[PDB]
Amino acid sequence: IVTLTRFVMEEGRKARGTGEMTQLLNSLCTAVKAIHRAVRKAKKLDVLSNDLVINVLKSSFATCVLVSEEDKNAIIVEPEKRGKYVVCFDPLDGSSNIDCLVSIGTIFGIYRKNSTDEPSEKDALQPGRNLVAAGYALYGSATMLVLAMVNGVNCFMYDPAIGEFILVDRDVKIKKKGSIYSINEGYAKEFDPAITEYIQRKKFPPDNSAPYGARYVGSMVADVHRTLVYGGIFMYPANKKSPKGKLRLLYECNPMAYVMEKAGGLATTGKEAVLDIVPTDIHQRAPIILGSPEDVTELLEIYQKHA
Amino acid sequence: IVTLTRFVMEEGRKARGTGEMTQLLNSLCTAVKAIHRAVRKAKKLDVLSNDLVINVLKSSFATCVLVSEEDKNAIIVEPEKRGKYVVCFDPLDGSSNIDCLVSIGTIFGIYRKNSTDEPSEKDALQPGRNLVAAGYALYGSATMLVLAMVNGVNCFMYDPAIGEFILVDRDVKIKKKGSIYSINEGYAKEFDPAITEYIQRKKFPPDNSAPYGARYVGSMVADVHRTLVYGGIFMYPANKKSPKGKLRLLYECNPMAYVMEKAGGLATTGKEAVLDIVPTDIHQRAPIILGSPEDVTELLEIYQKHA
Amino acid sequence: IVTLTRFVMEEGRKARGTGEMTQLLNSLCTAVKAIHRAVRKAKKLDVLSNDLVINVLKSSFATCVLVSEEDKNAIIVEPEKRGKYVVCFDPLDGSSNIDCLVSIGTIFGIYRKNSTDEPSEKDALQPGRNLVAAGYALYGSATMLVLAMVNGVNCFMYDPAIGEFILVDRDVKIKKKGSIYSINEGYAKEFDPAITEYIQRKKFPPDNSAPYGARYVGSMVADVHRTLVYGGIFMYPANKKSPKGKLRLLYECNPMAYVMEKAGGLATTGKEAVLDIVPTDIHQRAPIILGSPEDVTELLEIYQKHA
Amino acid sequence: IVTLTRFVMEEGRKARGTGEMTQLLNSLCTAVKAIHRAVRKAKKLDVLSNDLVINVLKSSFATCVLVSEEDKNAIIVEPEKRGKYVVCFDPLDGSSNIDCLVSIGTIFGIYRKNSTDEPSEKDALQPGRNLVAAGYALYGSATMLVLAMVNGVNCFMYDPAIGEFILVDRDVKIKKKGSIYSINEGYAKEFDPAITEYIQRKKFPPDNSAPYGARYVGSMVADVHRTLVYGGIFMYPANKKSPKGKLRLLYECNPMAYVMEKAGGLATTGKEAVLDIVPTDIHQRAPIILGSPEDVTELLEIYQKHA
C-alpha cells in the first residue's frame, strides 16, 4: 500500500519540508538496496558497503560531512554536491557476524549542519538530540528499514520483488517491560558491580518470577531490533578494560538511542542519557544501555544505588 | 562452478548411487527455495514451511515416513509415492526469532528405512548414526545449505539469481578449539554443576587467558552454524526443570550431531554421544553439547569429574 | 554508476526544477517496477497495470488529470493530492501480445496543466509539442525505461537486482536512414496508394539495393524501440476502413512522436507532424509514421506526390 | 503445484525411464536459468549462453555429441562425462533482436545416440523423427520452457522467485486454423510463386473474409511460440537466393517441427515433412513452414498445384 518513497514525501509535505531530506533518504535507500544485494549473495564486504553509502550520499547533493565507522577521517563533500546535512553511519554493523551468515545491517543518523563555518568534523560533534532523523537497515531473515524522525518510529520491509521498502509498522512503540536481556557476558570478569548485580537479578528473580531469557546475537542492530519489537534490554557497558564501553557514539549509539527514545524506550550510559552527551571525537565510544524503559530504569536504580 | 544438483549426482555416480537420494535432495532443495522466498518477504510462516517440506517430500517418491517438529503424529506417504527414505525435519527452526528478523532455518536428517515391516514411526526411531545424510538450510544474511553425508561436510550458497545452490566450502572441518561459548544463561539457576562450573571457567580463565566471547542467537541452526564455521561450543543442556534439555533428538539434535561429527566436531549429552542414543519417541528431547572437540571435551571432563 | 533517481534530480537542479516532476517520475518508476514484476511472472494483467499507474500517479501529488487507454473517461485527482501535471498513458501496450509472451510495455506523456480553469479533460487536449516529457517502459528481453525531455533522449535499464533503473544510453539519436520497415501488411487491401507504392519500393529497390528487412512485433513500444535503437521506419497508417489509423494520439502517438523527434527522428500522419495536431478527443486515433528521418521523408515525398 | 523437476521425473517413472534424460533436462534447465539471468540484465551474450549450455550439458554426464549454432565443429564430450545423448541447440535464437530487447530464446533437440561407433558428428545427422525430445526456452515478457516428448507438449513458466519452472499448460495442442501469417516479406522479390500466391490470398481473401493479421518478430522461437499458442502459420522459405531457406535443420528446424507435430501442428519444406529429412550436414539449412495444420495444408496445396 505505501512505499518509503511515498511516505517520506508525505512527511515533507507535512513540514513544508526541506525534502533535501527526501533526496537524502532516497539515496540512502538506494544504498541499502545495493547492500542488501551484495550481502545476500556473498573485509571487502565491509568495504564495499562503505563506498556505496559514501557515493550515494555524495550524489544526494544533501550532505556536507560524512562520518563512517570505516574511515579514519571525516569526509566533506566536494562543494558542488554540498548539502546541509551531516550523516554518520556504521555501514554494516557486525563484522564478526559477516562470515557466519548472522544478521548484519547499517546504522545511520542525520544531523542538520548548524555551523555557518565551512563544514568540518566539528559539524559532526553534536549531541544525539540534535539528530534530525535516525534509523537502521537490518539484513537478516528479511530486510527492514527502521526510520525514526521527530514524529515517531516507522518500519518498512524491503520487497526485493519490486525494489521498494514498504510500510509494515508505523509508528512503533516498545513494550514497557520485557523478558530478554542482551549482553556479551564473557566480559563478566570486567563488568562494573551494577551490571553484575543486575545480571544476577535477571537469572535469580528475587520476586520469584521467571528469569529473563538471554539473547546476544553479536550484531548491534540485530540486538537493538529484537529489543525494539519484542521489548527487553540490550547492554554494552564499560568494563575496567574499556572505560567508555565499545560502541561508538556517532554512528552506533545515538541513532539507536534516538530510535529507542522515539519508540518510547530509554538509552543511558548508566550515568546519563546517551543523546545528551556532546562528543569530543567523531570516533568516540560510549557505554550503552537501551530498550524497555521499565527495564533500563531498573538497572539505573542499581547504578544510582552503587554510587 | 558447481551446483548442488551437479554435486549430488556426482556423488551418486560415485556410489553406483541410489539416486533415490538425488530426487530427494532435489525436492528438498526445491523446498528450501520456497521457504527462502516466503521468509525473505514476510505461526503461519512456521506452518507454511511445514506443508512445503511435507508436499515436496511426498512428491519426491523417495520417502516413506516423515517426522516434523510441527506435527503431532508421524506421516506415512500414501503408497504410490512411497520411498525407502525416512525424513525428520524442523521445518523452520527458531520460532522466537521469526518476528524480529533474526536468522532462521530448516534442519533435516535422512534415514534409510531398514524395516521390512510396513512403514511406521518405529521406522523413525533409530539412533543418529544410522543417518544416511543430514543437513540444514540457514536463512540469514544469506541462504546456505549445509549438506553432510558419510563423505564429509559441504556448504552450498543459494544464489537467488539463478535459483541454484552453489558449492562454496566442501568439505568443512571445524576448528579444534574456539573462542565462543553459546548457551541461554537465563536458565542459570537451573544448570547442573558441571555446566555452571564450566561457564565460569570461560568467564574466568584459570590459565590466565582471554575469556571466551559469548553468543546466543536463539536459533539452533544459526548457533550451530556459527559454531561450525568459527569454532567454539554450543549448549542446550538439561536443567533441574527439563530433564532431557529442550532440543528434540530426531529433527534438531541428530542432524546437527551428524553435521558436527562429520566435520570432525563432537556432540554429547554430557553423558553420551547424541548419535548413539536410540530414541523411544519421535518427539523426544535430549541435552546437546556440540562443536569444537577440544572444547566439548573440556566440558565432558567436568561432567565426568562431577560424577 | 547512475540511477534514474540521481539522473532526474540532476536535471531538476539544472532547471531550478519543479521537481514536482521528480516525485512524478519517481512514482511512475515505482509503477513500472510493479508492472515489470507482475508481467514477468504472469484482461486482468491489462487491468492490474492500469490501477497501479493510476494509484501511484495519484499519490505522487503531482498530477491533476489522467488519460488512460483503459478508461472511458478521464480521471481527475481528488483535490488534496492535486498536481500541476497531466499524464496520459497506455498502461500496457500490446494486448494481443500479452498471452504469447511477446514484448509489451507502458507508454506515457506528461503535460503541464496550462488551464487556470479547474482540471478537466480539456486539460488533456493539447498538441504533442506541449509535452513536458514523454517516455515508455519496455518489458521484453529486459526492462528499459526510455525517458525523453526537452534536453534529449536517455535510456535506463532496470536492474531487478537492486530495484533501480540505470543509465545505459543518454542521450540517444536515431540513424538517419535504416534497413527495417515495420507495418502490419494484412491490411494491405486497405492501404492508401502512397503506403502501397512505398512498401513496394522497400521490396523492389529501384536503385538496385538490398530490400529492407521487415519486422512487425505487434506491440507499438517494441516496434517503436527497435526502430529507435536500430533505425528504420514504423507504420500504422489510416486505411479506407479506419480513417485516422488505429493508434491513439494522447497515450500512444504523441509520446512516441516526442521520443522520436527528440532523438532526431520524424513522426508524421503522412500529411502532418503528429505533435502539431491538436486533439478534440482524449481517445482519438491518428495515423502514425515515425523513425529515421531519411526514411520517413522518403514516404512523405510519396504522399505529397500522390496529392 | 508442479515443477518441471517433478514433472520430468514423473515421466521417468512412467517409462521405467532412463532418467539419464532427467539429469539432462535438469542441467538444461540450470542453463536456461543462467541465461534468463544474463539476458534480463544485459556478440558476447550470444557467446556467454553457448558456453553455459555446453558446460552444463557436459557435466550432465548424459550427452556424447553436441551441435551448436555457434560452433563450427561438433563437440564430443570427453569420455568420462559421456552420455547416450546427442543434443543440438541454438543457444540463443535471434541475434538481430538481442540489442533492441525483443524476445529471444534457446532451441534444443535431443537424440539418443544410436551408433555403436565411437560418437562422431554422424551421430547428429539423423532425421527429426528420431528425436527423443525437443523444446525451447523463450525469454520474452516472461520465461517459458516448452518441453515436448513423445507424450505431447507441455509449457512451464519460469518463476524467478523460487528458481523453478512450473507447469502452466500440458499438454498443448494448436488451433486447427488461425488468423496470423508470419514471414519476412522483404524477401518478397525472391519468394517462389507458391509463397507469393499464398501471401496474396492472406491479404485478399477470395472467400470474402477477414485478411490474416501479419506478425514477424524476428526471433524464430518468439514467432514459433506465438504460432503455437495462438494458431496461424510461420514461414522461412527458400528464395532464389537461399536454396534451402535460412533456418538450420538440427537446432532450429527439427525441434520446432517436433514441437509443432506433437502439438498437432504441421511442418513442411513445402515439398516434404521437415522431420523426415535426413541431413548431410550438422549445419545445413532447410525451408520451414509450420503451424496450424489447416493453414499449412492450404499452402501445401499451392505448392503441389504449382508443380
Ligand SMILES: O=P(O)(O)OC[C@H]1O[C@@](CO)(OP(=O)(O)O)[C@@H](O)[C@@H]1O
Ligand atoms: O564482540 P562484542 O564484544 O560482542 O561486540 C559486538 C558489537 O560490536 C559491533 C559494533 O561494530 O559489531 P562488530 O564489533 O562485530 O563490528 C556490534 O554490531 C555489536 O553489538
Ligand SMILES: O=P(O)(O)OC[C@H]1O[C@@](CO)(OP(=O)(O)O)[C@@H](O)[C@@H]1O
Ligand atoms: O528459547 P531458548 O531456551 O533459547 O531455546 C532456543 C532453541 O529452541 C529452538 C528449537 O526449536 O528454537 P524455538 O524454540 O524458538 O523454535 C532453537 O532454534 C533454539 O536453539
Ligand SMILES: O=P(O)(O)OC[C@H]1O[C@@](CO)(OP(=O)(O)O)[C@@H](O)[C@@H]1O
Ligand atoms: O493488431 P495491429 O493492427 O497490428 O495493431 C497493433 C498495435 O496496437 C497496439 C496499440 O494498443 O497494441 P494492441 O492493439 O494489441 O493493444 C500496439 O501495441 C500495436 O502497435
Ligand SMILES: O=P(O)(O)OC[C@H]1O[C@@](CO)(OP(=O)(O)O)[C@@H](O)[C@@H]1O
Ligand atoms: O533476418 P530474417 O531473414 O528475418 O531471419 C530471422 C530468423 O533468423 C533467426 C535464426 O538464427 O535469428 P537470427 O538470424 O537473428 O539469429 C531466427 O530467430 C529468425 O526466425
Ligand SMILES: [Mg+2]
Ligand atoms: Mg560496526
Ligand SMILES: [Mg+2]
Ligand atoms: Mg524448532
Ligand SMILES: [Mg+2]
Ligand atoms: Mg495499447
Ligand SMILES: [Mg+2]
Ligand atoms: Mg539463431
